[PDB]
Design a protein around this ligand. Structure first.
Ligand SMILES: Cc1ccc(C(=O)NC(=O)N[C@@H]2O[C@H](CO)[C@@H](O)[C@H](O)[C@H]2O)cc1
Ligand SMILES: Cc1ccc(C(=O)NC(=O)N[C@@H]2O[C@H](CO)[C@@H](O)[C@H](O)[C@H]2O)cc1
Lengths: 810, 810
C-alpha cells in the first residue's frame, strides 16, 4: 500500500501464507473452523518470529568470532509495549504480512490489537531502556539488555466513579511468543547468611539460594540483519527448598515472589525488602553471566576492554560492590586492582534531582540480607573519604556530605554516592539537568572528579515513534527526501526547504486530520465517548506527579470554562483537552488529581451552553500502545513541569516528531527542543530555573497570587465551595490546602503566563496555514532527539566503541 | 531393527530428519554446535507431536458429527509416566524415528531417558486411569480423562543414610511439549459464600471465584488413528483478586495453590481443606465443560443417553451433589427428575476396604466451603433413608449404618455412601474384592439395591507393559503368532502350543537374560551398585504399606542370611532381592520399613561368607519409568498382601505378562491369575480370606508364633538386640513392638508357609528348562488382564456403549 512499509513480493506473500497455515495447524492445534482472532494473532506472531531466528543465531555467533567489547545495559525496567508491528517494521515485512493476511481474509490491524503490552516499566526511565535497545541493535553494537521478567507489569488502570482503580496486569496469561526460556543457563543467587573470616580471605556462608532462570527476547535492528538479546531473569525455588511436606512445597512461592511484580511507585523511594531482593537478584545473576562470557572468549586487566556495564539509575547499583565481591573474594585479586577494574567497567545515569526519589537503603536491611556487601560498601566509603580528606584538608563538613553512609535516626546508604564513587562516568539526561547535577546535588563530587561528569541528552527511536505509529507522516516525508532518514534522523532538516511548499503544507495538515479522525473513532468504539475532530487536540499524557503540574492544566481548563460561561456568545477556538496517566497506588495527591480531572469533565462535558467548544477527557490506562495512538493525533503537547524538576522528558520528543506544537517551560529537554526549532516556533512560558531560585530565597507565598488574580480566586472558590462536587462539597479540600499552603511546585506562580501563552496558541490555530508551517519547522528540526544520536554519544564518550551502520549478511 | 517397531521407509526417515532439523532451528533456536542432549530430545518430541495433530483434530470433529455417547473419566490421579516412546509405538513410528536419529548421529534411547515422568499419581489407582485412557482410545470410545494439572507430582525419593528423603518433583521445569494450553476455555469455580432462599429457589451468593484453565494432552489409540483428550485443570486467580497493592498481587498465590501439588498420602485419609478444594475444583470445572458440550450438540431427559461419568474412587464424589445443584438451582428441574438423571449418569469404582483410607469429610468443612452442597447432601440423605425405612420397617440400626451422615464427636459425611446412593453402578476391581464389598462394608446397600453391584477386574495396557518396555519378548511372540495380539491379548493362548518347542523355550529364556543384563548395567551406571546377573531376580515393587507386607519379605531375606551363616559351605540358589517403593511422608511405620530394608542390605551385602549368593537392594525412586525397566528383568514377582486387603493389584499383571513367576497369597487379582494359569503354575501360599476371619474370631496372638518357631525367634532377637543397627541398638523397637503386639496384618501367621513356598521357588529355578516352561504357561494365559478387556466390560455393562476396533482415515 505505502512505500516505507516494504515490498509485497509474490514469493514472500505465498511463503508467509503457508507458514501462517502451518502454525495455525501444528502450533496452535486449530483449523479455520474453530479459530478465534487471538489464534490468528498467534499464528501471525509465530510466522514473523521464524524470520528472526536465523538472524538471531548468526548475530550471536558473529559476536563470538569477532569478540568485540560487549555493552551490558542493566535496568529494573524495560517498557517494551507490543512486539509484532515493530518486528515487521525492522524486518521490512509489514506490507508482505498485510497482503498475506488480506488474502487469508484477515485484517492485520485487528490482529495487532490482540497483543498485550510488555508493560515492564513505569514511564520515562523504562521507555528509555526500550528505545536504547532498538538503537543499539540498529547501530550494530554487541549489546545486551538485562532485567527482571515480571509476571505482572505496571497495573491496568480502570476509572470507577472518577477514581483510579488498579488491577493486575496478567500479561503472560495467553503466553508470550517472543521469549525463549533458557533453563540450561540457570544461575544461583544468594541471600542472608553471614560473613566468616579465614586465613585466606572473607567467606560468605550459610546463605539461602534462589535460582535465576533466563528468558531471551530478540531485539532486531532496523533492516541491518542484526538481532540482539534482551535477557530477563525469572526467580525459581531450588528443589530441596524447605526440604509439613505440603506446606514445604507451597512455601516455594516465597522464593519465586522475587520476580512476581513491578514496583509501581515512581514518585517516592520506599525501603521495602522485596524491592532490595529484586535489585540484587538481577545484579547477581547478570554479573555471573557477564564473567562467564568473558572467560569463554584469568587476566582481569582486560575486563574493562571487553565489558561495559551501564546502570539505569541507582536501581542496579549493587553491581559495584557485587563486582568487587566476585573479584576479591572469589578471584582473589587485591583490592586496588579490583577497584580499578570496577570503576573502568561501570557508568551511572541519573534521572531526577528530586530527593524523595533517591534510593537510600537502611543499613539494617543490608546487614541482614547482604552482610558481605555492607562490609564492602563500608570499605569503599573509608577509602573514598580518605581521598576527599587528602584533596580538601580540614573540610570536615564536606566529609559528612560526601559520605556514602548517611547518619541519623536510621543509618542509610546513599546509593547515588556509591554509583559516583564506583563509576568512570556519571551523566544527566538533558543539558540543563546535567548542569544542575554539577551545581547542586553532586557539586562536591564534581569538584573532586570533574572528568567523571557528562551530559547525554535523551532521545526516542524514530522506528516505533514515527514509522510504526504514524506511517502516513513517514510516507509523505519519504516522498520528498527518500527513506534514509529513518536511521539518520538529522536528514529531516532537508524538510526546511518545503516550508513554503503548498503541496507539502496540504499533505502535512491532511495526515494530522486523518490521525485525529482515526483517534476520534477509537474513542467512540472502545469507550463510547464523543469528540469533535475539528477542535484543537490539547493533550498531556505522562505519569501523574505534582511536579509535572497536571494541576496547572486543570486551572487553565476551568478558566476557559468560566470565560465561556461569562460570555457565551463570544467565539472561542474549540478544544478537546485530553489528560491521561497512571498514579502510583500510594500517592494520595496524584489520585486526587485524577478525580479532579474527571470531576471537571463531568461539569464541562454536560453544560449545554458550552456545546462542542470545550471537552475534557481523561485517557484511561495510558501505556505504550495508547501513546502510539494519541501522539500522532495531537495538535498541542503540554510539557509544563516547574523549571528544574523534569530531568529530560521524552514524551515531548515524541510529540515534536509527530507534528504537534509544544507549550512548555524551559525545563529538561524542552530547552534543547526550543533551541533546535527556534524560540519563535515554540510556545515557551513561565519561570526559568533562576526565577524559581529567586522565589525560594524570598519565600513562595501562594496567597499573593490568590489576592492579585481575580480569575484564579474564582477557581479556588469553586473548588472549595463544592462546585465540582455538589454531593461532597469538601472533596477537594486537600488540593486547595496544598495549593494555598504547601505547594513545592509553584503552580500559582506560572498561572498568568500560562493562560496568556495559551491564548497565543488558540490565535495561531485560527490560521491553519501558519500553524502547519510552524509544525513543519518543528518536525524538520527534531533529528537531534533520535536515540540513535544518544547511543552514538554513549558509545563514543562512555563505552569506547564505534557504532556501525553496516549490514550483516541475510 | 525388529518387526513390531514398524517400517523405516525412505520417505518417512527423510521427512523425520528434516522436521527434526526444522524444530531444532525454529522451535528451540539452536544449531548443532550449541545443542545439548535435552535440546535433541525436545526436537524429537516436537517432531513426533506433529504427527498427532491432524489425527487429534479429525478425531474431535468426528465425535462432533457422529455425536456418540461421551465417557467422562474423573480422577484426581493420572499416573502417565513418559509420553515419547508410547506415542511412537501407537503411531508405528518407532523404527523410523530410530533410523532418522541414528543418521543424524544420535541414540534415541539416550534421548528418551531425558523426558520427565508425568507423575500425577500415587500408585495403582492413578496408573489404572492411565492404562484406561490408552484402552478407551484403542477401542474407539469418545472418552475424555479429566483431572488436575499438578505443578508438582509425586515427590522424588532420595535415600540418605538409609532413610527416605522427599524432594519436589518439578516436572514442568523445562516445559511439557505434549500439552496445549486452552486459556479460551477458562471456567469459573466458586468457593465459600452463603445460601440465600428466594421465592423461586435457592441461590448461592457472595462466593470467592477461582478460575480453571484447561490444558489438553493427546491420548493416541493403538494404530487406529484415534486421538482422544486428557484435559487437566490449572488454578488461576481472577484479575481483580484482592483488588497494600504489592501484597494483593502476591496473595494471588493463595488461589493458585489449589493445583500446586499432589497429595502423596495413599494410606490414610486426611481431612485437609486444600484437598477438598482440589476435589471440588476438578468436579465443578469438569461438569460445566460436560454440560456445555451436551448443549452444543434444554431437554435433560436425554442427558444420560449422551453422558457417562465414571468416578475413580470417591475423590470426585462431589460430582453427584454438583450435578444436582446445576440441574435444580440453575436449570430449574424438579428434584426427582434431576435425581433420575444424576443416578443414570454416574457410576462409582471402589479401590479398598481398609477403613482408614475411606473419605469421611467433617461437616464443618463442607458447611464453610460448600454450604449449598451440604444442604443438597442432607436432602439426598433424608430421601435415601426414607427408602431404607420403607424397605426395612423397624430396622433402626440399619438406618444409622446406611446414613451418609456419620454421628460422633465430629459429624462427617461418608463419601462412599453418597456414591452408592447417587450411582446406577458400583464396582470392585477384582472378583474377590467385589464379593467382599457385597458381604462386608456395603452389605446393607447390596441388600437394598443388588442390581447396582458389579465386578470389573482390573487390567493393564499391553502397549506400555509389553511392546514398549519389553520389545524383545514382543518380537519373539510376534514371530510365532503374528502381531494382532497387541490389541487382542487373548491371542496369547496360542502360545500354549509352543510349551514343548525347544526353539521357543530357548528364545523366552534368552530374552529374560538380556533384560537382566541390561538392568544389571543400569544399576552400575546410574547407582554404582553391583549385582550377579545369574542370580534369581526376586522383586517386590509397589508403595510401602503394612498390608502389602514388605516386612514378610524382610523376614524371609533374614532367614536366608541366617541359614547361610549356619551352613556356609552348603549350596543355595543365588538371589538378588530387590525391594522398592515410596512411603507416604507421614506414614512413620512405612518409613521405618524402608530403613530396615537398607539396614539388612548393609549387613548382607558386606558379609564375606555370603559372597554373591545373596544381595539386598532398595530400588530408589520407584515410578512408572523405573517399572518399565525392572519388571522385564524380574524372575520372581512378590505379591504377598494379607488375604482380603489388596483390592486387586496391577503390578502382579505386569510381571505375569513379562515372564516372571508369581509368589503370592490368594488376594485381589492373584486369585484370577492363578485361575487363568493353573494353580500348578503359580506359587500360592498362606491364609485364605476365610482363615484370616477364623483367626480374628479367635484373636491373633503373635507370641504363639514366636514361641513355636525357633527361626522366627532368632530374627526378632536380632532386630531387638541391635544386630542390624550396632550403633543404635533400639532403632527397630517400633517394628518389633508392632509385630509382637499390634499387627493388623498377621505377618507371623504366614511366615512358615512363605519360607516353605520360597524353597519350592529355588528348587524350580535350579531346573532352567522347567522354570521357562512354567513361564510360558503364565505369559500364554495373561490375556484376560489386558485393560482392553476391562474397558470393553465397563463399556457394555456400565456405560452402554459398543467398542470399535475400526480405523479412522489417516
Ligand atoms: C523509585 C523510582 C522508581 C522509578 C522511577 C521512574 O520511573 N523514573 C523515571 O521514569 N524517570 C524519568 O526518566 C526519563 C528518562 O531519562 C526522563 O526523561 C524523565 O525526566 C524522568 O522523570 C522513579 C523512582
Ligand atoms: C486417600 C487415598 C488417596 C489415594 C489412594 C491410592 O493411591 N489408592 C490406590 O492406589 N489404590 C489401589 O488401586 C488399584 C487400582 O484399582 C488396585 O489395584 C490396588 O489394589 C489399590 O490398593 C488411597 C487413598
Amino acid at each position: 500500500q505505502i512505500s516505507v512499509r516494504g515490498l509485497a513480493g509474490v514469493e514472500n506473500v505465498t511463503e508467509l501464507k503457508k507458514n501462517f497455515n502451518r502454525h495455525l495447524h501444528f502450533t496452535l492445534v486449530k483449523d479455520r473452523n474453530v479459530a478465534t482472532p487471538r489464534d490468528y494473532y498467534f499464528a501471525l506472531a509465530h510466522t514473523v518470529r521464524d524470520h528472526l531466528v536465523g538472524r538471531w543465531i548468526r548475530t550471536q555467533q558473529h559476536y563470538y568470532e569477532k569478540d568485540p567489547k560487549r555493552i551490558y545495559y542493566l535496568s529494573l525496567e524495560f517498557y517494551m509495549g507490543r512486539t509484532l508491528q515493530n518486528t515487521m517494521v525492522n524486518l521490512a515485512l509489514e506490507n508482505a504480512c498485510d497482503e498475506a493476511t488480506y488474502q487469508l481474509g484477515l485484517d492485520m490491524e485487528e490482529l495487532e490489537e490482540i497483543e498485550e503490552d510488555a508493560g515492564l516499566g513505569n514511564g520515562g526511565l523504562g521507555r528509555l531502556a526500550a528505545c536504547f535497545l532498538d538503537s543499539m541493535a540498529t547501530l550494530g553494537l554487541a549489546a545486551y539488555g538485562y532485567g527482571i521478567r515480571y509476571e505482572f507489569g505496571i497495573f491496568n488502570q480502570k476509572i470507577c466513579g472518577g477514581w483510579q482503580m488498579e488491577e493486575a496486569d496478567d500479561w503472560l496469561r495467553y503466553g508470550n511468543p517472543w521469549e525463549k526460556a533458557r533453563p540450561e543457563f540457570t544461575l544461583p543467587v544468594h541471600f542472608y547468611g553471614r560473613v566468616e573470616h579465614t586465613s585466606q580471605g572473607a567467606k560468605w556462608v550459610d546463605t539461602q539460594v534462589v535460582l535465576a532462570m533466563p528468558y531471551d527476547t530478540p531485539v532486531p535492528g532496523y533492516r541491518n540483519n542484526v538481532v540482539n538479546t534482551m535477557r530477563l531473569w525469572s526467580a525459581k525455588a531450588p528443589n530441596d527448598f524447605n526440604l509439613g511436606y505440603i506446606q514445604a512445597v507451597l512455601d516455594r512461592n516465597l522464593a519465586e515472589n522475587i520476580s512476581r511484580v513491578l514496583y509501581p511507585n515512581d514518585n517516592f523511594f520506599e525501603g521495602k525488602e522485596l524491592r532490595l531482593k529484586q535489585e540484587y537478584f538481577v545484579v547477581a545473576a547478570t554479573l555471573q553471566d557477564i564473567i562467564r562470557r568473558f572467560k569463554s572468549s584469568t587476566n582481569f586487566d582486560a575486563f574493562p576492554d571487553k565489558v561495559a556495564i551501564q546502570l539505569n539509575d541507582t536501581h542496579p547499583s549493587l553491581a559495584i560492590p557485587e563486582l568487587m565481591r566476585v573479584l576479591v573474594d572469589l578471584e582473589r585479586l587485591d583490592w586496588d586492582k579490583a577497584w580499578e577494574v570496577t570503576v573502568k567497567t561501570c557508568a551511572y545515569t541519573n534521572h531526577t534531582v528530586l530527593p524523595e526519589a533517591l534510593e537510600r537503603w537502611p543499613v539494617h536491611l543490608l546487614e541482614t540480607l547482604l552482610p558481605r556487601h555492607l562490609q564492602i560498601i563500608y570499605e569503599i566509603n573509608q577509602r573514598f573519604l580518605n581521598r576527599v580528606a587528602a584533596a580538601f584538608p580540614g573540610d570536615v563538613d564536606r566529609l559528612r556530605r560526601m559520605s556514602l553512609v548517611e547518619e541519623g535516626a536510621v543509618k542509610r546508604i546513599n546509593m547515588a554516592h556509591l554509583c559516583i564513587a564506583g563509576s568512570h562516568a556519571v551523566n544527566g539526561v538533558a543539558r540543563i539537568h546535567s548542569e544542575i547535577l554539577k551545581k547542586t546535588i553532586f557539586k562536591d563530587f564534581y569538584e573532586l572528579e570533574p572528568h567523571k561528569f557528562q551530559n547525554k541528552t535523551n532521545g526516542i527511536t524514530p522506528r516505533r515513534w514515527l514509522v510504526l505509529c504514524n506511517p502516513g507522516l513517514a510516507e509523505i516525508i519519504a516522498e520528498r527526501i527518500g527513506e534514509e532518514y529513518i536511521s539518520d534522523l538529522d536528514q529531516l532538516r532537508k524538510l526546511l526547504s518545503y516550508v513554503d511548499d503548498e503541496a507539502f503544507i496540504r499533505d502535512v495538515a491532511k495526515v494530522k486530520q486523518e490521525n485525529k479522525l482515526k483517534f476520534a473513532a477509537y474513542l467512540e468504539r472502545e469507550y463510547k465517548v464523543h469528540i469533535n475532530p475539528n477542535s484543537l487536540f490539547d493533550v498531556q499524557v505522562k505519569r501523574i506527579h505534582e511536579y509535572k503540574r497536571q494541576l496547572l492544566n486543570c486551572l487553565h481548563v476551568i478558566t476557559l470554562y468560566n470565560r465561556i460561561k461569562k460570555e457565551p456568545n463570544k467565539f472561542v477556538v474549540p478544544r478537546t483537552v485530553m489528560i491521561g496517566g497512571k498514579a502510583a497506588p500510594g500517592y494520595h495527591m496524584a489520585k486526587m488529581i485524577i478525580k479532579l480531572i474527571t470531576a471537571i469533565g463531568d461539569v464541562v462535558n454536560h453544560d449545554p451552553v458550552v456545546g462542542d467548544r470545550l471537552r475534557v477527557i481523561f485517557l484511561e490506562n495510558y501505556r505504550v500502545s495508547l501513546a502510539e495512538k494519541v501522539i500522532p493525533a495531537a495538535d498541542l503537547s503540554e510539557q509544563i513541569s516547574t523549571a528544574g524538576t523534569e530531568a529530560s522528558g521524552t514524551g515531548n520528543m515524541k510529540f515534536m516528531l509527530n507534528g504537534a506544537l509544544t507549550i512548555g517551560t524551559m525545563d529538561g529537554a524542552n530547552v534543547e527542543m526550543a533551541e533546535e526549532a527556534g524560540e519563535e516556533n515554540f510556545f515557551i512560558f513561565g519561570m526559568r530555573v533562576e526565577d524559581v531560585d529567586r522565589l525560594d530565597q524570598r519565600g513562595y507565598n501562594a496567597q499573593e497570587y490568590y489576592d492579585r488574580i481575580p480569575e484564579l480566586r474564582q477557581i479556588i472558590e469553586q473548588l472549595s465551595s463544592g462546585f465540582f462536587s455538589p454531593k461532597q462539597p469538601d472533596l477537594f479540600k486537600d488540593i486547595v490546602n496544598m495549593l494555598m499552603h504547601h505547594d513545592r511546585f509553584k503552580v500559582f506562580a506560572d498561572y498568568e503566563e500560562y493562560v496568556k501563552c495559551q491564548e497565543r496558541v488558540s490565535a495561531l490555530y485560527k490560521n491553519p496555514r501558519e500553524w502547519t508551517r510552524m509544525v513543519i519547522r518543528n518536525i524538520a528540526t527534531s533529528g537531534k532527539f533520535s536515540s540513535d544520536r544518544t547511543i552514538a554519544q554513549y558509545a563514543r564518550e562512555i563505552w569506547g566503541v564505534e557504532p556501525s551502520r553496516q549490514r550483516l549478511p541475510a
